[PDB]
Amino acid sequence: DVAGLTPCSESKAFAKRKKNEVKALNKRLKNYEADSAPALALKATIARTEARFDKYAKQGLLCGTDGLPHLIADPGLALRYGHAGDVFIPTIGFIYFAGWLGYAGSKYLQAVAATAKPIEKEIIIDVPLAWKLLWEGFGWPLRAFAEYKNGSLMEDDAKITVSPR
Amino acid sequence: KYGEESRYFDLKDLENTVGSWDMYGQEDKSRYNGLQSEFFERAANGLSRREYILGLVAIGGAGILAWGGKGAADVRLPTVGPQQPAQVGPRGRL
Amino acid sequence: IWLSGMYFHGARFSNYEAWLTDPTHIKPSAQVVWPIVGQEILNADVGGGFQGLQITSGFFQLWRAAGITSELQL
Amino acid sequence: KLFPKFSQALAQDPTTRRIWFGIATAHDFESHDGMTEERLYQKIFASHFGQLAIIFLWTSGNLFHVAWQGNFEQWVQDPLHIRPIAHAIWDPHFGQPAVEAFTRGGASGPVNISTSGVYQWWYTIGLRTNQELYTGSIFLLVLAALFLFAGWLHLQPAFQPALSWFKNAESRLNHHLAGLFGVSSLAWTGHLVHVAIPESRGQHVGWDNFLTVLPHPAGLTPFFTGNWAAYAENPDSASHVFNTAQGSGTAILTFLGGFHPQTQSLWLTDMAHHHLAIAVIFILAGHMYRTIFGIGHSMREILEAQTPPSGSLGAGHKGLYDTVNNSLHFQLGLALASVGTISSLVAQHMYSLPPYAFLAQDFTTQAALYTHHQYIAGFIMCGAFAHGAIFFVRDYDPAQNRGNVLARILDHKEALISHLSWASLFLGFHTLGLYVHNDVVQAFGTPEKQILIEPVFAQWIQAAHGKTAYGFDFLLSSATSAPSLAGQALWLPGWLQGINSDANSLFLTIGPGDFLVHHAIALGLHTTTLILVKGALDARGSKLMPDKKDFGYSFPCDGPGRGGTCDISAWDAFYLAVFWMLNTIGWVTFYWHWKHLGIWQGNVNQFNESSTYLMGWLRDYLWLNSSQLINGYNPFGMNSLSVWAWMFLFGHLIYATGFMFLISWRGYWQELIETLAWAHERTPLANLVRWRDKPVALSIVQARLVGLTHFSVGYVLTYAAFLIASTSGKF
Amino acid sequence: SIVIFHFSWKMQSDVWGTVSANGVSHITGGNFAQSANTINGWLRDFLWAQSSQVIQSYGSALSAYGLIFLGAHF
Amino acid sequence: SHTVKIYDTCIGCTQCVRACPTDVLEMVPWDGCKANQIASAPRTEDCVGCKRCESACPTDFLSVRVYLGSETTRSMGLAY
Amino acid sequence: MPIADYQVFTALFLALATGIFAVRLGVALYK
Amino acid sequence: MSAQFLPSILVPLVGLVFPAVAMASMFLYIEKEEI
Amino acid sequence: MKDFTTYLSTAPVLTLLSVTVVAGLLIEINRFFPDALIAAF
Ligand code: CLA
Ligand code: CLA
Ligand code: CLA
Ligand code: CLA
Ligand code: CLA
Ligand code: CLA
Ligand SMILES: CC1=C(/C=C/C(C)=C/C=CC(/C)=C/C=C/C=C(C)/C=C/C=C(C)/C=C/C2=C(C)CCCC2(C)C)C(C)(C)CCC1
Ligand code: SF4
Ligand code: SF4
To answer: Any coiled-coil ranges, and where (chain I) (predicted)?
Structure first.
């Protein structure tokens, strides 16, 4: 319980929702054979639905009055009540991958900017160089922090074009 | 215009080089009967002044107000007629 | 290429053979979706022990008028 | 051909545009021929007088129509079972079924049901009979005539105020804070103590007997002796009946907090106490600036002293006093921004804290008032930013503001616009992504896969106010906390009783749907602000047009050169921002209306479950609540909702018509008009009739303005019709 | 757009239907002949009345049609 | 009647004069550029405002500027 | 106690006077 | 309402007489050549 | 062969191949690890 939320394990609405979904799937399954293709597909869907509901209830997710899982997006609140995998951990994972792609693109652009013909390098990508920079982008946090503390990650305001006010 | 050949410009006859033609106008003073013409010009004697002709239009404005205050009721307009019962509304209102 | 794809789908992912036996109750279908993110719900119960997307191109009627009858011909 | 008396250049225009531009530039006094600063200020002052007279006449008309064709007296006896009447209906086009269908609140004929809430307001301030309303209307009529005479008088040379008089900011602020704000609030407190409070207790107090009635049993003695606490001895009981003496009291300045159990609105004694405190504080604040009595403050020195060391803010606020006093657009922009924010505050406070008796029970009036004030606030905000841009392009002097906050904020305008764009992109990407994800999982029949982020921050703030529905036990949620014990016997009892009840709108319960809609609102606000700020900062010039300030605030473009310069002026930025403001206000009103629609019907589950995906918004709100509206008239008959159905289609038509001016541009119409002119000049009989002005297509800027006007009118009319018809056909 | 709307409403109100030995039961009951003369009829009896099938397709095989219906609007 | 102005940044390329559709600009002798010629607008009354001259100017910023002002029967391009 | 016809007539006359003052102010503003 | 005849006279005056008069006067004034 | 590899390195070809590879990887991740609502490690 965080904000009046009940765990999905003890939520009656959650169980009723699972029961209703499985019931609808079985109702659709009743109009087929026992080993036909549609019957097997419906059985697989039923198994997946049951596994999903069981996993959600076992993972400790919080359910509201409507019986659906709710996510806690607040450090500390999610860390002390065991909900860090809702938004905190996904935030870290995203930030890492997003920074990886961004750093790889930045390095490729800066590397090809020194070539005699950079526009062609932009429309016709250098596959080996792009591959090497994509691999190097995995250490983007360390490289970015080093460049920031080094002062080479920024451009002087006096060297950037600006409008005549 | 002096269009005797292929010349459609003439400074001495610039009036004809700009297409200033009546096309269909025709001057003729022999048409309307004198007795009927006199009757109409006599009927519309002083009504040729802007202030006087506007007065005739002002009569139309009075007729508009007369219709609302009398004409509308004489034609049994639904808005000037009566009303029958009413309803209560969605909930306990009026 | 587009026509070949239409005939191939009508021969491998359709219920044309079953639709021929009951063209008034079985709804024509010539597309089957893979089960990846719950999208398998799009495989409707068209009829004839087949599940797929209901098509409205009229290919089943055209093939019937041409006397296709079998899936090997498609 | 000389109608634009204020513009000699426009008078020389031989086309119809002369008339058009002759009306759209009538209030731009600064651009008129032979205009000075003194004449400009005097004309604005007289225009202000005229506007005040118009407002007074409008209020007088409302009062007169309610007292002449309304049912105010009948509504007073039964405020919950009688629909207020706005005015009568006299339409010769009405048919018999229409005449019979519009007769409702016991009227003699067809009438219009009021939706502005004037009945509840007038009933709460003490008005009870039609004679009082008529007297108020006559008084407002005389007041309007007086203001008109004042406007005419101050235009005469003997009564013309000098330009320096208009620049006396200290004196004006002193009089406005101490007199326009403080004295007015004190007078309102006097009226509430002498009329509103006694009238709510079943005692009539009017001009004929207000001098023989004691507002309090102990008259004036406790006030002058200092025993002010004696004015809050016995307040109205919890079982008090409005307009009657059962369960009444004698207190006039209480602070119970909460809502009246019967009227579901704020206590009159609390509002009187509020106005008295506000009057005292405003008067005190009014005694601050220096005038001619050797004491007070000098705003110029205060601004010149607000310069932090280390040069973090540069020169600080040096020269800002003159920048604001000399420029009228700066003052208008500040006033518009403040007024718009206050309008939004008023809209947000009147539904959660109803101030008028029997106002919360009127679902139609509450929704209409909230939507009206929110739309007004949006338009006023757009105007504030537009005038800020006008200031930058017409009254900003770089030499006079060298190094202050204005020059510095203009020096890094790129960072501001870039961050606004980033915030807008983030909000849009994620709000749309979450909504689409929920829609996709809902379509596949798997609602358990929805991404429902709990609004823990807003819930925490709600718990800080006393709501115990989230188990936080924070400040006001804990009975043993210091703030809880401090106001334990003051306003906390009623405040908590009203905030912990689900029967009112005082801090409603929120969930994932509220989280998503709030982020959508944040998106609308950020994008609208980005457009307006970008237009105001780039008004003087950009890389594409370095000398934009030389072309003024509004101009069609700069030609197709340099890649194209369509919609490059600041006016165009405001034009593009109006669309976003309408969209944001639409989202806000949609959220408010749907939530209250579910609350009024006792079904919060509908919004709690269908608001997490867009299909629920389109099906459970727009399509579901439009059945009665579109059924106002059908091949079977018509009802009182036919007016709203017609207005619904009318708004749709105006909006679509605006789409023409918005999509089609000037070029096609010019050639078409030329062809039409040729046809007229070659048609017999019709040749005898000529045009005085050469017919030409609408201007580029004029076309954008016409299209925007049509779009806004259709938007407002359509939503007003749908809102009123949906909340009126059900309640 | 107007042409296809006219065709759809006309066929659903005066052509398509079922025969029950007692007459023809059209899909919309023939409301075109009494409502297509006004814009409100087109908005209510055609756009609003016939849109309930696409806005209620979530959770079924036609859910895709309900998704595109929104996507297109975007 | 629009306002057409020429600035000293002009290089005398004569492109604006050739791009004018109503013969509003012309080249006159000058000594501030290598071409020894400057552009001028003696017949601004015939200017329509098409801004074709600006689209042809190669200097940065433009050496020829058109400010649309009071509209006349000639500036509006009306043949009726 | 509904307002009588004389009250409506008096209000209309006062409105006429107010309109006269308004037109005078408008004329002064035009100058 | 008191004086039921007033709306039947004021509505046409404000919607028919006043608009026609105002439009005619405005049209005559915006094309005066010398105001 | 050099020209063919250069054509395959163009912005549209590389964009479509990268999008296809990313989409395929995501589809297989969801196929083997479906209904991943939270990051359960
Ligand atoms: C005590 C002296 C005094 C007073 C009472 C006023 C009063 C006024 N002056 Mg003035 N002025 C003064 C001294 C004073 N002035 C002096 C000394 C100078 C020279 C320095 C000026 C120079 C001056 C100028 C140049 C102008 C004015 C203007 C105005 C008018 C402002 C517009 C308006 O009416 O909105 C009314 C404002 C309020 C009622 C206060 C607003 C309170 C908030 C914003 C509203 C919300 C309150 C509440 C919630 C509303 C609920 C009500 C609801 C139930 C309906 C106003 C009546 C302007 C004008 O319009 O000219 C006619 C104007 O142009 N004054
Ligand atoms: C206290 C409020 C206030 C004041 C005093 C001003 C004053 C001024 N504004 Mg401003 N403005 C405001 C608020 C205000 N504004 C707001 C809230 C907005 C946002 C909409 C704007 C947006 C704005 C812009 C974009 C511009 C101005 C401009 C101006 C200046 C000239 C105005 C003019 O030319 O008049 C002319 C008046 C009109 C043309 C009337 C407009 C016609 C309306 C919009 C149509 C209404 C139709 C109606 C609703 C239809 C009913 C529907 C029914 C038929 C079914 C002037 C000094 C202009 C300027 O500064 O010049 C450089 C300028 O371009 N304003
Ligand atoms: C539904 C209509 C619509 C939509 C979606 C947008 C969206 C947007 N507007 Mg816009 N606007 C609109 C109508 C709309 N506007 C109208 C009618 C007007 C009046 C003319 C304006 C005027 C206006 C102005 C003046 C500005 C914007 C800006 C923006 C951007 C703000 C940033 C943001 O919100 O991030 C979110 C981004 C989105 C919601 C776009 C969706 C992303 C897509 C769906 C992802 C792609 C996935 C997939 C691969 C699609 C490709 C498929 C294809 C290859 C086949 C944004 C992209 C501002 C801006 O540029 O911001 C910097 C800006 O200044 N708008
Ligand atoms: C799991 C699904 C998902 C998807 C499909 C997306 C998709 C997207 N996200 Mg997003 N995000 C997600 C989950 C997801 N996000 C989660 C769970 C979180 C945690 C709450 C975030 C937080 C997040 C942020 C803060 C941002 C995005 C942004 C974006 C957009 C550009 C991302 C990018 O890397 O571009 C390409 C990469 C670059 C162009 C350069 C790298 C830029 C990254 C984001 C900076 C990372 C390093 C930096 C120091 C981090 C500090 C950020 C600061 C605010 C604290 C994109 C459409 C960005 C955006 O909205 O654009 C305006 C954005 O800034 N996301
Ligand atoms: C619903 C919006 C709307 C409306 C009403 C119109 C209307 C019109 N368009 Mg248009 N158009 C629109 C959207 C709209 N368009 C959009 C979004 C675009 C962008 C693609 C275009 C692009 C476009 C082009 C390119 C052209 C038109 C043309 C026309 C005109 C055709 C002549 C005609 O229809 O006869 C009659 C007019 C109507 C039926 C409109 C409704 C008028 C009602 C029925 C009369 C009501 C009388 C009134 C109420 C009484 C007076 C009351 C008093 C208070 C004033 C017409 C006025 C063509 C044109 O110029 O005409 C030949 C033209 O070439 N449109
Ligand atoms: C701005 C306030 C306002 C508004 C919007 C209305 C609106 C209306 N009035 Mg009303 N009226 C008002 C003030 C107002 N009145 C006042 C103060 C009085 C007291 C004298 C009256 C007395 C009155 C009577 C006796 C009647 C109406 C009637 C009507 C209805 C038909 C209009 C008509 O033909 O009557 C004409 C209205 C008048 C002769 C007086 C109105 C004068 C106002 C104050 C002019 C205000 C102009 C405004 C401030 C400037 C805006 C510019 C604009 C003119 C372009 C209509 C809904 C009729 C009705 O009941 O319909 C069923 C009716 O018979 N009114
Ligand atoms: C552009 C421009 C302009 C305009 C501008 C604008 C328009 C602005 C605005 C703005 C706005 C619109 C703002 C707003 C705001 C707000 C704020 C700033 C606030 C706040 C806060 C606080 C401080 C609070 C606190 C509290 C309390 C008191 C109690 C309870 C709790 C709380 C926390 C709530 C100008 C002319 C000037 C200049 C130039 C140009
Ligand atoms: S705007 Fe057009 S007409 Fe005027 S000078 Fe330039 S090119 Fe010539
Ligand atoms: S185009 Fe520019 S540079 Fe060339 S002659 Fe004209 S003004 Fe001078």
So the answer is: none
C&D contacts, CB < 8 Å: 11
Cα D173 to chain centroid, rounded: 24
Residue D226: strand, helix, or coil: coil
Q: What's the maximum distance between 2 C-alpha atoms anywhere in chain F?
A: 45
* Cα angle: B76, vertex B77, B79; to 5 degrees: 130
F39 lies in which domain range?
1-80
Q: How many CB atoms lie within 10 A of CB G30?
A: 8
Please check whether residue D89 is in contact with residue D102, taking contact to mean a CB–CB distance below 8 angstroms: yes
Q: For a pocket test of ligand 8, which of F5, F14, F24, F68 has the largest count of ligand atoms closer than 8 A to its C-beta?
A: F24
Distance CA D316, CA D323 (A): 13
Token code pair at residue D221:
């003695």
> Residue D158 and residue D137: Cα distance in Å, rounded?
33
List, in order, residues 6 or more apart from C17 with CB less than 8 Å away.
C70, C71
> What are D180-185's contacts with CB under 8 Å, separation 24+?
D181/D278, D181/D279, D181/D282, D181/D286, D182/D278, D182/D279, D182/D280, D182/D281, D182/D282, D182/D283, D182/D284, D182/D285, D182/D286, D183/D279, D183/D283, D184/D279, D185/D275, D185/D276, D185/D278, D185/D279, D185/D282
Reference C56, options C27, C19, C35, C36; nearest CA is C27
Residue for token pair 């700069």? D558
> Around D83, how many Cα atoms within 13 Å sit in the side-chain half-sphere?
28
The DSSP H or E segment spanning D57 is: helix D37-69
Contact F76 D547 (CB under 8 A): no
Nearest Cα residue in chain F from D546: F61
Contacts of residue D683, Cβ cutoff 8 Å, sequence gap at least 6: none
Ligand 3 neighbours by CB, cut-off 6 Å: D 421, 424-425, 428-429, 432, 523, 527, 530-531, 576, 579-580; E 74
Residue closest to A71 by CA, chosen among I40, I38, D469, D442: I38
Crossing angle between the packed helical segments A140-150 and A88-112, to the nearest 10 degrees: 60
Task: For chain A, give every domain's residue range.
Answer: 1-165
How many domains does chain F fold into?
A: 1
| Whether the Cβ atoms of residue D245 and residue D201 lie closer than 8 Å to each other | yes
For residues D264 and D242, the answer to whether their CB atoms sit within 8 Å is: no
**Residue G27 and residue D156 in contact, taking contact as beta carbons nearer than 8 Å:** no
Determine the Cα–Cα distance for residues D157 and D418; give it in Å rounded to an integer: 52
Bond from prior residue into F61 cis (ω within 30 degrees of 0): yes
Partners of residue F66 on adjacent β-strands: F4
Nearest-CA distance from C57 to chain A in Å?
24
Q: Read off the tokens for A113.
A: 């900017």
Q: How far does CA D441 lie from the centroid of its chain?
A: 39
Experimental method: cryo-EM
DSSP letter string, D61-88: HHHHHHHHHS-HHHHHH-TTSS--EEEE
- Whether ligand 7 lies within 6 angstroms of the CB of D392 is answered as yes
Torsion sign across C-alpha atoms D205, D207, D209, D213: positive
Find residue A70's DSSP bridge partners.
A62
Strands (E), chain B: none
Tell me how many helices (H) and strands (E) chain B has: 3, 0
Which among B70, B54, B65 has a CA at the least distance from the CA of H17?
B65
Contact present, F42 and F23 (Cβ < 8 Å) = no
Structure-token match 């201007």, residue found: D699
Structure tokens at B73: 């009721």
Mapped onto helix, strand or coil, the DSSP state of residue C52 is strand
Q: Which helix (H) or strand (E) holds F67?
A: strand F64-67
Q: What are phi and psi of F29, to 5 degrees?
A: -65, 145
